[PDB]
Nucleic acid binder design. Structure first.
Lengths: 311, 310
DNA sequence: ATACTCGAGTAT
DNA sequence: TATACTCGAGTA
Protein backbone atom coordinates (compact mmCIF):
# COMPACT_ATOMS: atom_id res chain seq x y z
CA UNK A 1 0.00 0.00 0.00
CA UNK A 2 2.43 2.71 1.26
CA UNK A 3 5.03 3.43 -1.42
CA UNK A 4 7.83 1.67 0.39
CA UNK A 5 5.58 -1.33 1.19
CA UNK A 6 5.72 -2.26 -2.46
CA UNK A 7 9.34 -3.44 -2.14
CA UNK A 8 9.92 -3.57 1.68
CA UNK A 9 8.16 -6.10 3.83
CA UNK A 10 10.54 -6.18 6.80
CA UNK A 11 13.34 -4.11 8.35
CA UNK A 12 15.98 -6.39 7.06
CA UNK A 13 14.72 -6.16 3.49
CA UNK A 14 16.73 -2.90 3.67
CA UNK A 15 20.00 -4.56 4.80
CA UNK A 16 22.89 -4.92 2.28
CA UNK A 17 23.96 -8.53 1.86
CA UNK A 18 27.44 -9.95 2.33
CA UNK A 19 27.70 -10.78 -1.39
CA UNK A 20 26.68 -7.28 -2.41
CA UNK A 21 29.39 -5.85 -0.11
CA UNK A 22 32.09 -8.13 -1.60
CA UNK A 23 30.90 -7.28 -5.14
CA UNK A 24 31.10 -3.53 -4.32
CA UNK A 25 34.57 -3.74 -2.86
CA UNK A 26 35.75 -5.68 -5.96
CA UNK A 27 34.24 -3.11 -8.39
CA UNK A 28 35.77 -0.25 -6.32
CA UNK A 29 39.22 -1.89 -6.64
CA UNK A 30 38.80 -2.36 -10.37
CA UNK A 31 37.98 1.30 -10.83
CA UNK A 32 40.85 2.32 -8.52
CA UNK A 33 43.30 0.37 -10.71
CA UNK A 34 41.90 2.02 -13.84
CA UNK A 35 42.32 5.47 -12.22
CA UNK A 36 45.83 4.70 -10.86
CA UNK A 37 47.82 4.85 -14.13
CA UNK A 38 47.94 8.67 -14.51
CA UNK A 39 49.36 8.85 -10.95
CA UNK A 40 52.13 6.38 -11.65
CA UNK A 41 52.92 8.02 -15.00
CA UNK A 42 53.13 11.47 -13.35
CA UNK A 43 55.62 9.90 -10.85
CA UNK A 44 57.63 8.47 -13.82
CA UNK A 45 57.59 11.91 -15.43
CA UNK A 46 58.63 13.59 -12.17
CA UNK A 47 61.62 11.30 -11.90
CA UNK A 48 62.73 12.18 -15.45
CA UNK A 49 62.42 15.91 -14.63
CA UNK A 50 63.95 15.73 -11.21
CA UNK A 51 66.83 13.57 -12.33
CA UNK A 52 68.65 16.54 -13.88
CA UNK A 53 69.32 17.81 -10.27
CA UNK A 54 72.60 16.38 -9.12
CA UNK A 55 71.90 17.39 -5.53
CA UNK A 56 68.75 17.82 -3.45
CA UNK A 57 69.28 21.58 -3.32
CA UNK A 58 69.44 21.63 -7.06
CA UNK A 59 65.77 20.54 -7.14
CA UNK A 60 64.89 24.07 -6.00
CA UNK A 61 65.87 25.37 -9.43
CA UNK A 62 63.67 23.11 -11.54
CA UNK A 63 60.57 25.32 -11.54
CA UNK A 64 58.54 22.65 -13.38
CA UNK A 65 58.61 20.36 -10.33
CA UNK A 66 57.97 22.80 -7.45
CA UNK A 67 54.32 21.80 -6.98
CA UNK A 68 55.34 18.12 -6.91
CA UNK A 69 58.06 19.03 -4.33
CA UNK A 70 55.46 20.80 -2.17
CA UNK A 71 53.20 17.76 -2.42
CA UNK A 72 56.04 15.32 -1.62
CA UNK A 73 56.87 17.52 1.42
CA UNK A 74 53.61 16.41 3.03
CA UNK A 75 51.24 19.14 1.85
CA UNK A 76 47.89 18.01 0.41
CA UNK A 77 46.16 20.34 -2.03
CA UNK A 78 43.48 20.78 0.64
CA UNK A 79 46.14 21.95 3.18
CA UNK A 80 47.96 24.10 0.63
CA UNK A 81 45.02 26.53 0.57
CA UNK A 82 45.91 27.62 4.13
CA UNK A 83 49.66 28.13 3.68
CA UNK A 84 51.53 31.37 2.85
CA UNK A 85 54.29 31.28 0.20
CA UNK A 86 56.81 31.17 3.10
CA UNK A 87 55.13 28.19 4.70
CA UNK A 88 55.27 26.40 1.37
CA UNK A 89 58.97 27.16 0.78
CA UNK A 90 59.65 26.12 4.32
CA UNK A 91 57.86 22.80 3.81
CA UNK A 92 59.96 22.14 0.71
CA UNK A 93 63.16 22.94 2.60
CA UNK A 94 62.09 20.51 5.32
CA UNK A 95 61.71 17.81 2.71
CA UNK A 96 65.18 18.57 1.34
CA UNK A 97 66.87 18.76 4.78
CA UNK A 98 64.97 16.04 6.56
CA UNK A 99 64.65 13.44 3.88
CA UNK A 100 66.44 14.04 0.60
CA UNK A 101 69.87 14.98 1.87
CA UNK A 102 69.79 12.11 4.36
CA UNK A 103 68.89 9.66 1.48
CA UNK A 104 72.19 10.71 -0.07
CA UNK A 105 72.70 8.86 -3.35
CA UNK A 106 69.09 7.65 -3.18
CA UNK A 107 67.61 11.15 -3.02
CA UNK A 108 65.65 10.97 -6.36
CA UNK A 109 63.77 7.83 -5.40
CA UNK A 110 63.35 9.27 -1.87
CA UNK A 111 61.48 12.15 -3.59
CA UNK A 112 59.46 9.92 -5.97
CA UNK A 113 58.51 7.49 -3.15
CA UNK A 114 57.32 10.42 -0.96
CA UNK A 115 55.52 12.07 -3.84
CA UNK A 116 53.57 8.74 -4.46
CA UNK A 117 52.94 7.98 -0.82
CA UNK A 118 51.21 11.39 -0.33
CA UNK A 119 49.55 11.33 -3.82
CA UNK A 120 47.90 8.05 -2.74
CA UNK A 121 45.67 10.06 -0.37
CA UNK A 122 44.78 12.28 -3.38
CA UNK A 123 43.83 9.20 -5.48
CA UNK A 124 41.77 8.00 -2.49
CA UNK A 125 39.98 11.37 -2.45
CA UNK A 126 39.31 11.16 -6.19
CA UNK A 127 37.94 7.60 -5.83
CA UNK A 128 35.46 8.63 -3.05
CA UNK A 129 34.07 11.32 -5.44
CA UNK A 130 33.99 8.78 -8.30
CA UNK A 131 31.94 6.34 -6.20
CA UNK A 132 29.46 9.13 -5.56
CA UNK A 133 29.01 10.03 -9.23
CA UNK A 134 28.61 6.38 -10.21
CA UNK A 135 25.79 6.03 -7.66
CA UNK A 136 24.02 9.05 -9.13
CA UNK A 137 24.47 7.49 -12.59
CA UNK A 138 22.94 4.21 -11.41
CA UNK A 139 19.84 5.94 -10.08
CA UNK A 140 19.46 7.98 -13.30
CA UNK A 141 19.77 4.80 -15.41
CA UNK A 142 16.95 3.28 -13.31
CA UNK A 143 14.82 6.45 -13.77
CA UNK A 144 15.29 6.72 -17.57
CA UNK A 145 14.74 2.97 -18.04
CA UNK A 146 11.52 3.25 -16.05
CA UNK A 147 10.39 6.14 -18.39
CA UNK A 148 11.52 4.18 -21.46
CA UNK A 149 9.73 0.98 -20.39
CA UNK A 150 6.58 3.07 -19.81
CA UNK A 151 6.92 4.75 -23.21
CA UNK A 152 7.23 8.22 -21.58
CA UNK A 153 9.51 10.67 -23.32
CA UNK A 154 11.78 12.93 -21.29
CA UNK A 155 14.26 15.81 -21.67
CA UNK A 156 17.65 15.86 -20.07
CA UNK A 157 20.23 18.33 -18.86
CA UNK A 158 23.87 17.79 -19.71
CA UNK A 159 26.10 18.08 -16.60
CA UNK A 160 28.93 19.23 -18.92
CA UNK A 161 26.93 22.36 -19.84
CA UNK A 162 27.24 24.62 -16.79
CA UNK A 163 24.68 27.19 -17.89
CA UNK A 164 22.49 24.21 -16.91
CA UNK A 165 19.68 25.57 -18.98
CA UNK A 166 19.64 23.63 -22.25
CA UNK A 167 17.08 20.87 -21.75
CA UNK A 168 17.50 18.41 -24.60
CA UNK A 169 15.17 15.77 -25.88
CA UNK A 170 16.03 12.18 -25.13
CA UNK A 171 18.11 10.67 -27.98
CA UNK A 172 16.67 7.57 -29.85
CA UNK A 173 19.06 5.30 -27.94
CA UNK A 174 19.75 6.73 -24.52
CA UNK A 175 22.47 4.12 -23.85
CA UNK A 176 24.74 5.59 -21.18
CA UNK A 177 22.90 8.97 -21.16
CA UNK A 178 23.02 8.71 -17.31
CA UNK A 179 26.79 9.29 -17.48
CA UNK A 180 26.13 12.94 -18.20
CA UNK A 181 22.74 13.75 -16.87
CA UNK A 182 22.46 16.52 -14.27
CA UNK A 183 18.65 16.34 -14.47
CA UNK A 184 15.74 14.59 -16.21
CA UNK A 185 12.33 16.01 -16.95
CA UNK A 186 9.02 14.37 -17.92
CA UNK A 187 5.22 14.74 -17.92
CA UNK A 188 2.94 12.14 -16.35
CA UNK A 189 -0.88 12.53 -16.16
CA UNK A 190 -0.58 16.14 -17.35
CA UNK A 191 1.83 17.04 -14.55
CA UNK A 192 5.36 18.23 -15.39
CA UNK A 193 8.17 16.86 -13.28
CA UNK A 194 11.84 17.89 -13.15
CA UNK A 195 14.48 15.89 -11.26
CA UNK A 196 17.81 17.57 -10.53
CA UNK A 197 20.86 16.34 -8.65
CA UNK A 198 22.98 18.28 -6.16
CA UNK A 199 21.03 21.47 -5.94
CA UNK A 200 21.36 24.19 -3.33
CA UNK A 201 17.96 24.40 -1.66
CA UNK A 202 17.36 27.97 -0.65
CA UNK A 203 15.07 27.42 2.36
CA UNK A 204 17.55 25.16 4.15
CA UNK A 205 20.58 26.84 2.52
CA UNK A 206 22.13 23.37 2.07
CA UNK A 207 22.81 21.19 -0.93
CA UNK A 208 20.52 18.20 -1.54
CA UNK A 209 21.43 15.10 -3.54
CA UNK A 210 18.03 14.64 -5.24
CA UNK A 211 15.33 17.24 -5.88
CA UNK A 212 12.02 16.70 -7.69
CA UNK A 213 10.23 19.82 -8.85
CA UNK A 214 6.64 20.36 -9.71
CA UNK A 215 7.31 22.33 -12.90
CA UNK A 216 8.11 22.12 -16.62
CA UNK A 217 11.90 21.75 -17.23
CA UNK A 218 13.62 28.47 -5.25
CA UNK A 219 9.80 28.50 -4.82
CA UNK A 220 9.32 26.18 -1.80
CA UNK A 221 5.90 25.03 -2.98
CA UNK A 222 7.58 23.66 -6.18
CA UNK A 223 9.61 21.09 -4.23
CA UNK A 224 7.73 17.77 -4.44
CA UNK A 225 10.55 15.60 -3.08
CA UNK A 226 14.04 15.93 -1.53
CA UNK A 227 16.27 12.95 -0.97
CA UNK A 228 19.73 11.78 0.04
CA UNK A 229 21.57 9.15 -2.03
CA UNK A 230 24.59 7.29 -0.54
CA UNK A 231 26.56 5.19 -3.02
CA UNK A 232 29.21 4.05 -0.59
CA UNK A 233 29.78 0.28 -0.35
CA UNK A 234 31.68 0.24 2.92
CA UNK A 235 29.61 -1.17 5.77
CA UNK A 236 31.93 0.72 8.25
CA UNK A 237 30.66 3.97 6.67
CA UNK A 238 26.98 2.91 6.57
CA UNK A 239 25.86 4.25 9.98
CA UNK A 240 28.37 7.16 9.72
CA UNK A 241 26.86 8.64 6.51
CA UNK A 242 23.30 7.71 7.57
CA UNK A 243 23.77 9.84 10.82
CA UNK A 244 24.91 12.69 8.50
CA UNK A 245 21.95 12.25 6.08
CA UNK A 246 19.46 12.08 8.86
CA UNK A 247 20.48 15.55 10.10
CA UNK A 248 20.36 16.77 6.52
CA UNK A 249 16.81 15.45 6.10
CA UNK A 250 15.78 16.91 9.47
CA UNK A 251 17.12 20.35 8.46
CA UNK A 252 14.89 19.93 5.33
CA UNK A 253 11.76 18.87 7.18
CA UNK A 254 12.24 21.56 9.81
CA UNK A 255 12.70 24.44 7.38
CA UNK A 256 9.91 23.35 5.04
CA UNK A 257 7.38 22.76 7.86
CA UNK A 258 8.03 26.23 9.13
CA UNK A 259 6.67 27.36 5.82
CA UNK A 260 3.73 25.04 6.01
CA UNK A 261 5.21 22.67 3.41
CA UNK A 262 5.57 18.91 3.59
CA UNK A 263 7.75 17.79 0.57
CA UNK A 264 8.27 14.00 0.35
CA UNK A 265 11.65 12.78 1.62
CA UNK A 266 13.66 9.70 0.66
CA UNK A 267 16.88 7.92 1.60
CA UNK A 268 18.62 5.54 -0.82
CA UNK A 269 21.79 3.80 0.28
CA UNK A 270 24.07 1.02 -1.03
CA UNK A 271 25.50 0.22 2.48
CA UNK A 272 22.64 -0.31 4.92
CA UNK A 273 23.32 -2.00 8.26
CA UNK A 274 20.81 -3.44 10.78
CA UNK A 275 20.63 -0.58 13.34
CA UNK A 276 20.19 2.15 10.73
CA UNK A 277 17.68 -0.12 8.85
CA UNK A 278 15.58 -0.16 12.02
CA UNK A 279 15.64 3.61 12.18
CA UNK A 280 14.74 4.00 8.46
CA UNK A 281 11.86 1.54 8.92
CA UNK A 282 10.61 3.43 11.98
CA UNK A 283 10.72 6.70 9.98
CA UNK A 284 8.85 5.14 7.07
CA UNK A 285 6.18 3.83 9.54
CA UNK A 286 5.92 7.23 11.26
CA UNK A 287 5.70 9.02 7.98
CA UNK A 288 8.77 11.10 8.68
CA UNK A 289 10.54 9.47 5.67
CA UNK A 290 8.33 8.84 2.58
CA UNK A 291 10.31 6.06 0.91
CA UNK A 292 13.67 4.31 0.91
CA UNK A 293 15.59 1.78 -1.12
CA UNK A 294 18.81 -0.20 -0.85
CA UNK A 295 20.70 0.85 -4.02
CA UNK A 296 22.30 -2.61 -4.47
CA UNK A 297 18.83 -4.22 -4.76
CA UNK A 298 17.36 -3.81 -8.21
CA UNK A 299 13.79 -4.53 -7.30
CA UNK A 300 13.82 -1.83 -4.62
CA UNK A 301 15.42 0.71 -6.84
CA UNK A 302 12.98 -0.06 -9.65
CA UNK A 303 9.93 0.15 -7.42
CA UNK A 304 11.16 3.44 -5.93
CA UNK A 305 11.87 4.90 -9.41
CA UNK A 306 8.48 3.91 -10.81
CA UNK A 307 6.94 5.55 -7.76
CA UNK A 308 9.07 8.71 -8.26
CA UNK A 309 7.99 9.07 -11.86
CA UNK A 310 4.34 8.92 -10.81
CA UNK A 311 4.56 11.41 -7.92
CA UNK B 1 23.73 28.73 31.49
CA UNK B 2 27.36 27.25 31.84
CA UNK B 3 28.13 28.04 28.26
CA UNK B 4 27.57 31.75 28.92
CA UNK B 5 30.76 31.83 30.96
CA UNK B 6 32.84 31.52 27.78
CA UNK B 7 30.42 32.27 24.89
CA UNK B 8 28.80 35.65 24.41
CA UNK B 9 27.78 35.32 20.77
CA UNK B 10 27.32 32.70 18.08
CA UNK B 11 30.56 33.67 16.45
CA UNK B 12 32.60 33.09 19.59
CA UNK B 13 32.23 29.41 18.54
CA UNK B 14 33.76 29.93 15.11
CA UNK B 15 37.31 28.69 14.39
CA UNK B 16 39.66 31.39 13.17
CA UNK B 17 41.71 31.21 9.98
CA UNK B 18 44.89 31.39 12.09
CA UNK B 19 43.87 28.32 14.11
CA UNK B 20 43.02 26.45 10.87
CA UNK B 21 46.41 27.31 9.34
CA UNK B 22 48.15 26.26 12.56
CA UNK B 23 46.17 22.97 12.64
CA UNK B 24 46.98 22.09 9.05
CA UNK B 25 50.69 22.79 9.70
CA UNK B 26 50.70 20.62 12.80
CA UNK B 27 48.88 17.77 10.93
CA UNK B 28 51.50 17.93 8.13
CA UNK B 29 54.32 17.83 10.69
CA UNK B 30 52.82 14.72 12.25
CA UNK B 31 52.23 13.14 8.83
CA UNK B 32 55.92 13.59 7.96
CA UNK B 33 56.85 12.01 11.29
CA UNK B 34 54.58 9.03 10.57
CA UNK B 35 55.66 8.66 6.91
CA UNK B 36 59.10 7.17 7.45
CA UNK B 37 58.02 3.58 8.33
CA UNK B 38 55.98 3.56 5.10
CA UNK B 39 58.95 4.59 2.91
CA UNK B 40 61.25 2.18 4.76
CA UNK B 41 58.81 -0.68 4.17
CA UNK B 42 58.87 0.27 0.45
CA UNK B 43 62.73 0.18 0.49
CA UNK B 44 62.65 -3.19 2.17
CA UNK B 45 59.97 -4.46 -0.28
CA UNK B 46 62.23 -3.46 -3.17
CA UNK B 47 65.14 -5.38 -1.64
CA UNK B 48 62.97 -8.51 -1.21
CA UNK B 49 61.20 -8.21 -4.57
CA UNK B 50 64.45 -7.66 -6.43
CA UNK B 51 65.25 -11.34 -6.20
CA UNK B 52 62.54 -11.97 -8.85
CA UNK B 53 63.93 -11.76 -12.35
CA UNK B 54 60.41 -11.68 -13.83
CA UNK B 55 56.98 -10.44 -12.60
CA UNK B 56 55.78 -14.05 -12.46
CA UNK B 57 58.71 -14.83 -10.17
CA UNK B 58 57.18 -12.53 -7.51
CA UNK B 59 54.51 -15.14 -6.94
CA UNK B 60 57.11 -17.38 -5.32
CA UNK B 61 58.43 -14.91 -2.75
CA UNK B 62 56.10 -15.75 0.10
CA UNK B 63 57.36 -12.88 2.22
CA UNK B 64 55.97 -10.18 -0.13
CA UNK B 65 52.56 -11.62 -0.88
CA UNK B 66 50.70 -9.23 1.38
CA UNK B 67 52.48 -6.22 -0.17
CA UNK B 68 51.72 -7.63 -3.67
CA UNK B 69 48.02 -7.80 -2.76
CA UNK B 70 48.19 -4.25 -1.47
CA UNK B 71 50.00 -2.97 -4.60
CA UNK B 72 47.29 -4.77 -6.67
CA UNK B 73 44.82 -2.12 -5.38
CA UNK B 74 43.35 -3.96 -2.33
CA UNK B 75 43.11 -1.89 0.87
CA UNK B 76 43.17 -3.83 4.18
CA UNK B 77 39.54 -2.82 4.61
CA UNK B 78 38.55 -4.34 1.22
CA UNK B 79 40.71 -7.41 1.92
CA UNK B 80 38.29 -8.55 4.58
CA UNK B 81 35.57 -9.27 1.94
CA UNK B 82 37.79 -11.13 -0.56
CA UNK B 83 38.15 -14.91 -0.88
CA UNK B 84 41.64 -16.34 -1.41
CA UNK B 85 40.84 -16.72 -5.14
CA UNK B 86 39.77 -13.02 -5.33
CA UNK B 87 43.12 -12.08 -3.91
CA UNK B 88 45.06 -14.45 -6.27
CA UNK B 89 43.13 -12.93 -9.09
CA UNK B 90 43.91 -9.37 -7.97
CA UNK B 91 47.59 -10.16 -7.80
CA UNK B 92 47.51 -11.72 -11.30
CA UNK B 93 45.86 -8.58 -12.64
CA UNK B 94 48.68 -6.54 -11.20
CA UNK B 95 51.22 -8.85 -12.86
CA UNK B 96 49.52 -8.99 -16.24
CA UNK B 97 48.19 -5.44 -16.38
CA UNK B 98 51.04 -3.45 -14.94
CA UNK B 99 54.24 -5.34 -14.12
CA UNK B 100 54.74 -7.26 -17.40
CA UNK B 101 53.97 -4.18 -19.44
CA UNK B 102 56.57 -2.18 -17.34
CA UNK B 103 59.09 -4.69 -18.66
CA UNK B 104 62.51 -3.80 -17.37
CA UNK B 105 61.01 -1.31 -14.91
CA UNK B 106 58.72 -3.85 -13.31
CA UNK B 107 60.21 -3.71 -9.77
CA UNK B 108 59.79 0.07 -9.58
CA UNK B 109 56.29 -0.35 -11.09
CA UNK B 110 55.49 -2.60 -8.14
CA UNK B 111 57.14 -0.28 -5.53
CA UNK B 112 55.45 2.84 -6.96
CA UNK B 113 52.05 1.07 -6.89
CA UNK B 114 52.66 -0.30 -3.36
CA UNK B 115 53.37 3.33 -2.17
CA UNK B 116 50.53 4.94 -4.08
CA UNK B 117 47.98 2.59 -2.43
CA UNK B 118 49.78 2.60 0.94
CA UNK B 119 49.31 6.43 0.89
CA UNK B 120 45.60 5.93 1.54
CA UNK B 121 46.58 3.68 4.47
CA UNK B 122 48.79 6.44 5.93
CA UNK B 123 45.90 8.86 5.40
CA UNK B 124 43.67 6.45 7.41
CA UNK B 125 46.25 6.22 10.20
CA UNK B 126 46.57 10.00 10.33
CA UNK B 127 42.81 10.58 10.69
CA UNK B 128 42.82 8.27 13.76
CA UNK B 129 45.92 10.00 15.13
CA UNK B 130 44.18 13.39 14.84
CA UNK B 131 41.26 11.99 16.89
CA UNK B 132 43.55 10.60 19.66
CA UNK B 133 45.46 13.86 19.90
CA UNK B 134 42.13 15.76 20.35
CA UNK B 135 41.14 13.40 23.16
CA UNK B 136 44.59 13.98 24.77
CA UNK B 137 44.15 17.74 24.59
CA UNK B 138 40.85 17.57 26.42
CA UNK B 139 42.33 15.24 29.08
CA UNK B 140 45.27 17.59 29.56
CA UNK B 141 42.73 20.42 30.17
CA UNK B 142 40.79 18.28 32.66
CA UNK B 143 43.85 17.15 34.66
CA UNK B 144 45.30 20.63 34.66
CA UNK B 145 41.97 21.97 35.95
CA UNK B 146 42.08 19.38 38.82
CA UNK B 147 45.76 20.14 39.50
CA UNK B 148 45.29 23.90 39.61
CA UNK B 149 42.33 23.28 42.02
CA UNK B 150 44.44 20.97 44.21
CA UNK B 151 42.09 18.03 43.65
CA UNK B 152 43.63 14.59 43.40
CA UNK B 153 42.48 12.10 40.84
CA UNK B 154 43.00 8.52 39.69
CA UNK B 155 43.52 7.47 36.15
CA UNK B 156 43.00 4.50 33.80
CA UNK B 157 45.81 3.43 31.46
CA UNK B 158 44.55 2.99 27.90
CA UNK B 159 47.58 0.77 27.31
CA UNK B 160 46.15 -2.38 28.81
CA UNK B 161 42.81 -3.18 27.50
CA UNK B 162 41.57 -4.61 30.77
CA UNK B 163 40.50 -1.08 31.73
CA UNK B 164 40.35 -1.80 35.42
CA UNK B 165 43.71 -0.73 36.91
CA UNK B 166 42.70 2.69 38.26
CA UNK B 167 45.88 4.36 39.45
CA UNK B 168 46.75 7.30 41.65
CA UNK B 169 47.81 10.46 39.84
CA UNK B 170 51.71 10.48 39.76
CA UNK B 171 53.49 13.48 41.44
CA UNK B 172 54.21 15.01 38.01
CA UNK B 173 51.45 14.07 35.61
CA UNK B 174 53.39 15.62 32.66
CA UNK B 175 51.94 13.98 29.56
CA UNK B 176 49.68 11.63 31.57
CA UNK B 177 47.02 12.54 28.97
CA UNK B 178 48.87 10.50 26.35
CA UNK B 179 47.64 7.29 27.93
CA UNK B 180 44.55 8.09 29.92
CA UNK B 181 41.35 6.26 28.94
CA UNK B 182 39.57 7.77 31.97
CA UNK B 183 40.04 10.16 34.93
CA UNK B 184 38.27 9.94 38.28
CA UNK B 185 37.86 12.50 41.07
CA UNK B 186 35.77 13.59 44.10
CA UNK B 187 34.48 17.17 44.45
CA UNK B 188 32.24 18.30 47.29
CA UNK B 189 31.57 14.70 48.33
CA UNK B 190 30.48 13.62 44.83
CA UNK B 191 32.54 10.92 43.05
CA UNK B 192 32.94 11.45 39.31
CA UNK B 193 34.41 9.23 36.59
CA UNK B 194 35.17 10.42 33.06
CA UNK B 195 35.65 7.76 30.37
CA UNK B 196 36.28 8.06 26.60
CA UNK B 197 34.71 6.01 23.81
CA UNK B 198 32.36 3.88 25.77
CA UNK B 199 29.53 1.82 24.34
CA UNK B 200 26.43 3.25 25.97
CA UNK B 201 23.90 0.54 26.80
CA UNK B 202 20.62 2.37 26.17
CA UNK B 203 21.50 3.89 22.79
CA UNK B 204 23.74 0.83 21.91
CA UNK B 205 26.21 3.31 20.37
CA UNK B 206 29.67 4.45 21.27
CA UNK B 207 30.00 7.94 22.85
CA UNK B 208 33.21 10.02 22.82
CA UNK B 209 32.90 11.41 26.37
CA UNK B 210 31.00 9.84 29.33
CA UNK B 211 30.82 11.26 32.87
CA UNK B 212 29.58 8.79 35.51
CA UNK B 213 28.10 9.59 38.86
CA UNK B 214 30.29 6.82 40.31
CA UNK B 215 33.69 6.42 41.94
CA UNK B 216 35.96 4.27 39.74
CA UNK B 217 24.51 -0.33 32.11
CA UNK B 218 22.83 1.66 34.86
CA UNK B 219 21.83 4.46 32.40
CA UNK B 220 21.03 6.59 35.45
CA UNK B 221 24.75 6.61 36.41
CA UNK B 222 25.31 8.82 33.33
CA UNK B 223 25.63 12.50 34.25
CA UNK B 224 26.89 13.66 30.87
CA UNK B 225 27.42 12.37 27.32
CA UNK B 226 29.35 14.40 24.74
CA UNK B 227 30.75 14.35 21.21
CA UNK B 228 34.37 15.56 20.63
CA UNK B 229 35.57 16.42 17.08
CA UNK B 230 39.29 17.16 16.81
CA UNK B 231 39.30 17.57 13.03
CA UNK B 232 40.95 20.80 11.79
CA UNK B 233 39.45 20.72 8.29
CA UNK B 234 36.77 23.38 7.83
CA UNK B 235 35.39 21.31 4.86
CA UNK B 236 34.60 18.52 7.38
CA UNK B 237 33.17 20.89 10.02
CA UNK B 238 29.49 20.75 8.97
CA UNK B 239 29.86 17.12 7.84
CA UNK B 240 30.96 15.78 11.25
CA UNK B 241 28.60 18.11 13.10
CA UNK B 242 25.62 16.68 11.08
CA UNK B 243 26.85 13.24 12.17
CA UNK B 244 27.28 14.32 15.85
CA UNK B 245 23.88 15.83 15.94
CA UNK B 246 22.20 12.52 15.06
CA UNK B 247 24.40 10.80 17.68
CA UNK B 248 23.24 13.35 20.33
CA UNK B 249 19.61 12.99 19.24
CA UNK B 250 19.75 9.19 19.56
CA UNK B 251 21.12 9.81 23.11
CA UNK B 252 18.46 12.30 24.13
CA UNK B 253 15.76 10.12 22.62
CA UNK B 254 16.74 6.83 24.31
CA UNK B 255 17.47 8.38 27.67
CA UNK B 256 14.23 10.50 27.83
CA UNK B 257 12.30 7.32 27.11
CA UNK B 258 13.62 6.12 30.38
CA UNK B 259 12.86 9.39 32.13
CA UNK B 260 16.57 10.34 32.15
CA UNK B 261 18.02 13.68 31.18
CA UNK B 262 21.93 13.36 31.12
CA UNK B 263 23.67 16.61 30.15
CA UNK B 264 25.02 16.76 26.62
CA UNK B 265 27.97 18.58 25.10
CA UNK B 266 29.69 19.15 21.77
CA UNK B 267 33.32 20.13 21.49
CA UNK B 268 34.82 20.79 18.06
CA UNK B 269 38.12 22.17 16.65
CA UNK B 270 36.58 23.07 13.22
CA UNK B 271 33.38 25.10 13.73
CA UNK B 272 31.88 27.06 10.86
CA UNK B 273 29.19 29.77 10.93
CA UNK B 274 26.09 27.75 9.95
CA UNK B 275 26.71 24.90 12.44
CA UNK B 276 27.71 27.59 15.08
CA UNK B 277 24.20 29.02 14.74
CA UNK B 278 22.66 25.60 15.26
CA UNK B 279 24.89 24.86 18.30
CA UNK B 280 23.97 28.33 19.71
CA UNK B 281 20.26 27.62 19.16
CA UNK B 282 20.50 24.27 20.97
CA UNK B 283 22.40 25.83 23.89
CA UNK B 284 19.74 28.56 24.15
CA UNK B 285 16.84 26.10 23.99
CA UNK B 286 18.46 23.82 26.56
CA UNK B 287 18.78 20.86 24.10
CA UNK B 288 22.58 21.07 24.31
CA UNK B 289 24.02 21.76 27.81
CA UNK B 290 27.46 23.15 26.87
CA UNK B 291 29.86 23.55 23.96
CA UNK B 292 33.40 24.73 23.34
CA UNK B 293 35.68 25.32 20.34
CA UNK B 294 38.68 23.05 21.06
CA UNK B 295 41.17 25.50 19.52
CA UNK B 296 40.15 28.20 22.06
CA UNK B 297 41.79 27.63 25.37
CA UNK B 298 39.57 29.87 27.42
CA UNK B 299 36.52 27.98 26.16
CA UNK B 300 38.01 24.59 26.80
CA UNK B 301 39.16 25.63 30.31
CA UNK B 302 35.78 27.06 31.24
CA UNK B 303 34.01 23.90 29.99
CA UNK B 304 36.46 21.60 31.88
CA UNK B 305 36.09 23.55 35.15
CA UNK B 306 32.33 23.20 34.72
CA UNK B 307 32.65 19.43 33.98
CA UNK B 308 34.69 18.87 37.12
CA UNK B 309 31.99 20.58 39.20
CA UNK B 310 29.00 18.78 37.73
C1' DA C 1 32.77 30.37 -1.26
C1' DT C 2 30.22 26.70 1.49
C1' DA C 3 29.49 22.02 2.23
C1' DC C 4 29.30 18.06 -0.51
C1' DT C 5 31.56 12.93 -2.33
C1' DC C 6 33.03 8.25 0.94
C1' DG C 7 36.35 4.82 2.83
C1' DA C 8 41.56 4.79 4.55
C1' DG C 9 42.35 3.34 9.17
C1' DT C 10 40.91 2.39 14.34
C1' DA C 11 38.55 0.40 18.81
C1' DT C 12 35.45 -2.22 21.97
C1' DT D 1 32.98 -9.25 17.50
C1' DA D 2 29.44 -7.10 15.45
C1' DT D 3 29.39 -2.64 15.10
C1' DA D 4 30.51 1.89 14.48
C1' DC D 5 34.04 5.02 15.65
C1' DT D 6 38.43 8.45 13.93
C1' DC D 7 38.69 12.66 9.99
C1' DG D 8 40.30 14.77 5.62
C1' DA D 9 41.71 13.26 0.56
C1' DG D 10 39.24 15.00 -3.09
C1' DT D 11 34.89 17.58 -5.58
C1' DA D 12 31.42 21.30 -7.20
Amino acid sequence: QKPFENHLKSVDDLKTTYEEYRAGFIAFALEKNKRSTPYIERARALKVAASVAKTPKDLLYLEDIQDALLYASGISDKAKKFLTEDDKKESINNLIENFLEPAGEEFIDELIFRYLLFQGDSLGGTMRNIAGALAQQKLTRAIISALDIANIPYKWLDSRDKKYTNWMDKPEDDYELETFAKGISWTINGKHRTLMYNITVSLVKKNVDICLFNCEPQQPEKYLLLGELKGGIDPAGADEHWKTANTALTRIRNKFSEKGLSPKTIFIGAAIEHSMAEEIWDQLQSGSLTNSANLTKTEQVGSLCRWIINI
